[PDB]
Amino acid sequence: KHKILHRLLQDS
Amino acid sequence: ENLYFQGASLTEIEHLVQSVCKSYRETCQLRLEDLLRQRSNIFSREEVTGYQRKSMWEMWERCAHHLTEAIQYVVEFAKRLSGFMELCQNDQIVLLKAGAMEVVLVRMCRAYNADNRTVFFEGKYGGMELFRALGCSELISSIFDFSHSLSALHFSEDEIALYTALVLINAHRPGLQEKRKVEQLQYNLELAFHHHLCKTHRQSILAKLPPKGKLRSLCSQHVERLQIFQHLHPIVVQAAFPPLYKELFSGG
Numbered sequence: 001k002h003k004i005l006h007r008l009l010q011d012s
Numbered sequence: 013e014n015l016y017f018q019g020a021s022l023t024e025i026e027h028l029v030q031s032v033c034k035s036y037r038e039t040c041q042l043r044l045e046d047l048l049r050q051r052s053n054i055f056s057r058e059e060v061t062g063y064q065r066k067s068m069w070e071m072w073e074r075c076a077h078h079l080t081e082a083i084q085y086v087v088e089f090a091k092r093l094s095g096f097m098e099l100c101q102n103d104q105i106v107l108l109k110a111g112a113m114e115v116v117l118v119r120m121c122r123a124y125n126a127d128n129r130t131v132f133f134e135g136k137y138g139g140m141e142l143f144r145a146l147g148c149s150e151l152i153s154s155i156f157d158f159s160h161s162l163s164a165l166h167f168s169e170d171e172i173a174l175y176t177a178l179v180l181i182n183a184h185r186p187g188l189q190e191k192r193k194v195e196q197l198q199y200n201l202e203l204a205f206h207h208h209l210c211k212t213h214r215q216s217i218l219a220k221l222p223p224k225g226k227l228r229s230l231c232s233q234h235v236e237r238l239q240i241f242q243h244l245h246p247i248v249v250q251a252a253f254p255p256l257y258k259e260l261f262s263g264g
């Protein structure tokens with residue numbers, strides 16, 4: 001259930 | 013939410029070419045100057061044998077991590093692309109899940125040397141025989157053939173920038189909620205790419221670009237071979253494959 005894209009997209 | 017979600021003027025398209033080339037330059041992972049300089053640095057017969065003697069799971073883990081590192085640079089490229097951050101999160105993830113591997117497959121032609129059919133891998137250049145332990149020879153041969161075909165086009169860095177922006181911004185991807193916004197951004201990026209080719213007398217490359225079905229076929233083969241490997245070594249995938257790789261290719 002790995003979800004990383006949302007973290008990369010929201011990290012600024 | 014962005015100028016490029018509507019019709020853009022010629023001056024706005026010129027501004028888009030520059031923005032895309034900038035986004036690519038700042039996220040390209042490896043410098044073209046480095047890749048060309050390292051061409052003379054080739055794995056020895058001893059080193060090739062060492063990679064062939066690695067276990068299938070060890071080689072899959074290494075290649076999955078190299079792909080994930082490449083994909084992380086594509087995610088940053090997408091984030092810098094005009095209009096991409098103004099799309100909804102559902103659509104950004106649809107576009108990245110479908111297109112990040114396709115962008116890596118295009119970018120990798122820079123690291124491929126058509127003179128001796130070698131790729132830059134783990135510090136040196138090696139042929140497809142370097143990957144023999146993976147047990148997916150057709151997929152490796154297909155990836156090498158693809159890089160060879162793109163190498164024959166003699167792409168500039170700016171052409172790769174514009175072509176990869178268009179690979180990513182594809183309004184046909186299933187699952188897009190704001191399809192009309194993506195269609196307009198794609199239209200403007202298509203104009204930017206074609207404008208640049210027109211200006212540089214490089215329009216002849218358009219008929220030579222690979223069909224979309226070719227990138228799709230490579231992505232499908234990778235997922236198919238991964239499913240075979242996962243059946244053989246499920247705990248290697250569960251315990252040692254990168255989380256982003258699993259999110260993109262094995263549904264989490």
Ligand SMILES: O=S(=O)(c1ccc(F)cc1)N1CCOc2cccc(Nc3ccccc3F)c2C1
Binds near residue numbers: 076079151
């Ligand atoms: O391992 S790589 O050096 C490589 C370089 C050249 C090849 F033909 C193969 C690997 N790296 C960079 C090239 O981008 C790609 C592009 C595609 C795939 C992968 N990996 C991969 C390959 C096979 C199985 C699982 C996998 F994950 C990578 C990863």
